[PDB]
Amino acid sequence: ARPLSELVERGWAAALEPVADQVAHMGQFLRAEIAAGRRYLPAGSNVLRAFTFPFDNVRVLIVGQDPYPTPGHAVGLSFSVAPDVRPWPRSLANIFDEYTADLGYPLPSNGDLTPWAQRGVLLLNRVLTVRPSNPASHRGKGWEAVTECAIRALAARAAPLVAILWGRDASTLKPMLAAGNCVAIESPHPSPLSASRGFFGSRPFSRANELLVGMGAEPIDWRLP
Ligand SMILES: O=c1[nH]cc(F)c(=O)[nH]1
Ligand SMILES: [Cl-]
Structure with a gap:
């Protein structure tokens, strides 16, 4: 029970100012769900x-659909699991197969993508909550305006940005991102x-x-332990 500035990093709080109302609304929706x-x-x-x-160090955004539907998997970073979770969700296994194929690095030890988030990758989902076992159950309930606002904010900065859009719902962001400083890569979901x-084969990394x-931007260090 905090306002935006307390929920997110300072830069993000400024970026998400237009949707402070909508975030509060979503808190009311989630309260009602419980x-x-x-x-x-x-x-x-x-x-x-x-x-x-x-918000300032973001250089890449990876965008998926909505959180993992199995309790114990979703942790608020798209595609990530806690470092003690196994077996990995199949989407993540597929992501890691593409990681090794693309970059040649060893298979990761665990499924925690926190290193990417700490290095300038925004690990976004188009919709930020889900009912358990019910993928896409919160689609159309009010998150889309929030995640849109985030993307538009990033695209409005005077900085290069690359978006990696995984799947159909993420693909909706492509036109939003398309000024000359922004480049989007799209593929089917993993x-x-x-x-x-x-x-x-998409070699997104x-x-x-x-x-x-x-x-003219620095590349991302994709390496995972
Ligand atoms: O965070 C996510 N986990 C699983 C998905 F399939 C997705 O799109 N995003
Ligand atoms: Cl439920």
Whole structure:
């Protein structure tokens, strides 16, 4: 029970100012969900976690759909799990197969993507909560304006940005991001169902670095332990 500035990093609090009202609304929605006896993921204190790393250092945004639907998996950073979670969700296993294929680094030891978030990657979902076992259950309930505002804010900075958009809902952001300082990469989602359609082979990590370097920005260090 805090205002924006307390929920997110200082730069993000400034960026998300237009949606402070909407964030408060979403808190009221989630309260109502609990009152009704429906659950949501991730934990309340993690819902805005992706915005707890500096808005200024963001260079890449990875965007997915909505949080993992299995309790114990979603932690407020898209695609990430806690470092003691295994087996990994299949989407993450597929992401890590593409990581090794693209970059040649060893398979990660765990599924925690916190290093990426600490290095300038925004790990966003288009929708920031979900009911358990019910993927896409909070689509259309008010998060989209919040995540739109985030993206537009990033795209408005006088800095290079690369977006990696995984799946259909993320793909909706592409036109928003398209001024000349912003470059979006789009592919099918890494989940098993969709990955065969073009996630594998997409080389998003090396491509995003080629793009950053070509715009004069530092590349991302993608290495995971
Ligand atoms: O954070 C997420 N986990 C799983 C997904 F499939 C997705 O889109 N985002
Ligand atoms: Cl529920």
